[PDB]
Amino acid sequence: YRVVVLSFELLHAPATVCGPKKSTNLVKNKCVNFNFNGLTGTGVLTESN
Amino acid sequence: ANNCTFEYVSQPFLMDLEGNFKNLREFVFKNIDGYFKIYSKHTPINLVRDLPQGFSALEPLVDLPIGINITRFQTLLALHRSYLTPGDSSSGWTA
Predict the structure, then answer these.
(1) Which stretches does the entry tag as region Disordered (chain A)?
(2) Does B92 touch chain A (CB under 8 A)?
(3) Cα–Cα dist B65/B35, whole Å
(4) Mutating which of A16, A17, A18, A37 best tests the B interface, going by the most B Cβ atoms within 10 A?
(5) Interatomic CA distance for residues B53 and B42, integer angstroms
(6) How many CB atoms lie within 10 A of CB B26?
(7) CB contact, 8 Å: A16 with chain B?
(8) CB-based contacts of B91: which residues, under 8 Å, 6+ apart?
């Protein structure tokens, strides 16, 4: 029986491994809840120059 | 080299240096919450021995998740001459 022991260390250190952050589609010109890299908000996204 | 708990490879920080074509490379190093932050900016300099007069902002460059205490630092140099045979002069680089 091939066996692997994974030991995770969550201590006082800058975290290096994390679960992937999945996303959804991006919709503009509409009032929407947005979350960009942890920045949360509610508003209308429009093309900015 | 033990507990090698971090390795990073990327494009050169210091570009090619290949007569008075001096270059100013300014860097800022910080150690905050285990994150090692390096900021830098580069500009060709013209016949100014010391720091010049002007304003140039350093753009963020790299944030390393190294997370280990730091107290001291030292710069790394290049031996163009030979250690066993130190010549009288001109073996180095323009004194």
Answers:
(1) 12-34
(2) no
(3) 5
(4) A16
(5) 15
(6) 13
(7) yes
(8) B80, B81, B82
